[PDB]
Design an enzyme around this catalytic site. Structure first.
Site, PDB file in Angstrom:
ATOM      1  CG  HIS B  41      -0.289   0.127   2.527  1.00 14.18           C
ATOM      2  ND1 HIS B  41       0.158   1.330   3.031  1.00 14.18           N
ATOM      3  CD2 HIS B  41      -0.003  -0.804   3.468  1.00 14.18           C
ATOM      4  CE1 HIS B  41       0.700   1.132   4.220  1.00 14.18           C
ATOM      5  NE2 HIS B  41       0.614  -0.154   4.509  1.00 14.18           N
ATOM      6  N   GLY B 143       3.297   5.939  10.523  1.00 11.25           N
ATOM      7  CA  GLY B 143       4.626   5.764   9.982  1.00 11.25           C
ATOM      8  C   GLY B 143       5.353   4.524  10.451  1.00 11.25           C
ATOM      9  CB  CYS B 145       3.184   0.826   7.654  1.00  7.48           C
ATOM     10  SG  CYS B 145       1.538   1.354   8.186  1.00  7.48           S
TER      11      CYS B 145
END
Lengths: 299, 300
Positions: B41, B143, B145
């Site tokens: 993503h 942030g 991820c």
């Protein structure tokens, strides 16, 4: 909101194994000096009334076996700085990071790298209890494990494990050999003082709950600094000073709740309990999150 | 007493974390050999997350559209491919800090360490367990991820989790290193409801066995119960049912001690109906369910 520990990468490369006779423990390899507890030169029968100044005279450079993984470090000199042996080796550690030796106050938090025979095995976050002890997890062979805090590029070493009290708690010194608490490095009956709850850390934790949206302990009432300490002293909570209010300033602006207003909520929690409710999923009040830790983890 | 929830040293993992930027989105990546792993993503804007067509989005991207940065050294992307929900970015230079690693898929109830990272810089490490609803309860800000979960055995690192999404209930969801999601979750910005979270019964029993070895015995009772009757009581407290496989795993614990598995279940049943009454077990005022039986019978 979990209790996170600092990354241990910069510290893992400094751990070595120190052997003197039969005793084997962990040491800290910085530059060309190895730091380890001074009781490594004492046998199990010498821990009754050891004479370190006389025992160190007997020993020589070849009685110390310093091992860094597979390589062997050669000791060329030895010295003692209070309750810490300083072994001078022939090779400097290329993994030496920007470090600093500091002494912390009770109530502050730091990460501990538990090691066995010079090999790291685990890391966890803990706080220095008001009785100068730590509720750590140290087994046999974990002596010499270090506690540290990590600045942006500097590692501050503040603790070294020395002894294990017969209550599950552990005691140690700083990197300069100065003990935390009234303990001495001898095998005898040593009692830890009455542990008290870190009131300032609980208030910072309550502010973190408000940030996470869990706002049910808040009340319209407020109390004075003198009145709260009366309740705090009764429930074995450390007295709250004006400097504690100043530290909680940044957390007060973010949430909009005054320190004395928050103390009224904490006062009600101690007297009336949790009323069958949970704060941040816990039925008890956590006291191992300093106000600085809350700012780091939230804002 | 004292049983600390300890996390593995993160040194071998800190050297594999990189920063991946695609347009405006920036998250963390895992640099192993000549391949960088990151959630797919990253090629999605805040508007595409509702109904993302990853095949349409990926075909329009080029190698130069991905910015991989390991500290100050910028890596050159030479190719890319998509495996399920993860993106594999092939770089020109292999990672010299690559340790002996493995990819494993874990089951609910197993524990692992998580290295939380922000913009390719590690910030903290903590120990957690995969909940029965295929979620994790940790601290993940925006942030984070791309942060990975791992276990270390001797010198081998076993990567098992990569953070992808944060659920509206406050828990986090992710995939394994092959891109397969844990649970029925998907990488969309839609209303995804996690299942009911239940206590890991087998972990509690293993923790109680460690207590009797370490000294605590106040919770023991003289009664015994059948497996079927225990589950009927356990389900009333949102406890996971116990199977025959769990009984066999707890075998060595019942061998070192003298308490049968069904005997310990009766003691746990009595604890639930009465509570702690102000007492503690191994220095804990609550029943811990994040200690696996394997870890229990290694550090007894």
């Amino acid at each position: 909101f979990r209790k996170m520990a600092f990354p241990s990468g910069k510290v893992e490369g400094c751990m070595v194994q120190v052997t003197c006779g039969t005793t084997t423990l962990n040491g800290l390899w910085l530059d060309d000096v190895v730091y380890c507890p001074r009781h490594v030169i004492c046998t199990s029968e010498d821990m009754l009334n050891p004479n370190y100044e006389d025992l160190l005279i007997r020993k020589s450079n070849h009685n110390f076996l310093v091992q860094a993984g597979n390589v062997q470090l050669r000791v060329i000199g030895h010295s003692m700085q209070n309750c810490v042996l300083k072994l001078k080796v022939d090779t400097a550690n290329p993994k030496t990071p920007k470090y600093k030796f500091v002494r912390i106050q009770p109530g502050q938090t730091f990460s501990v790298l538990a090691c066995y025979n010079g090999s790291p095995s685990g890391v966890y976050q803990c706080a220095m209890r008001p009785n100068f002890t730590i509720k750590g997890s140290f087994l046999n062979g974990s002596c010499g494990s270090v506690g540290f805090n990590i600045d942006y590029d500097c590692v501050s070493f503040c603790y070294m494990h020395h002894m294990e009290l017969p209550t599950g708690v552990h005691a140690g010194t700083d990197l300069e050999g100065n003990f935390y608490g009234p303990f001495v490095d001898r095998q005898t009956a040593q009692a830890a003082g009455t542990d008290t709850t870190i009131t300032v850390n609980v208030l910072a934790w309550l502010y973190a709950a408000v940030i996470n949206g869990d706002r049910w302990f808040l009340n319209r009432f407020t109390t004075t600094l003198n009145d709260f300490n009366l309740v705090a002293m009764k429930y074995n909570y450390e007295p709250l000073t004006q400097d504690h209010v100043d530290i909680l300033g940044p957390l007060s602006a973010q949430t909009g709740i005054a320190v004395l207003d928050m103390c009224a909520s904490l006062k009600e929690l101690l007297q009336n309990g949790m009323n069958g409710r949970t704060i941040l999923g816990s039925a008890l009040l956590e006291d191992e999150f300093t106000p600085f830790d809350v700012v780091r983890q939230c804002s």
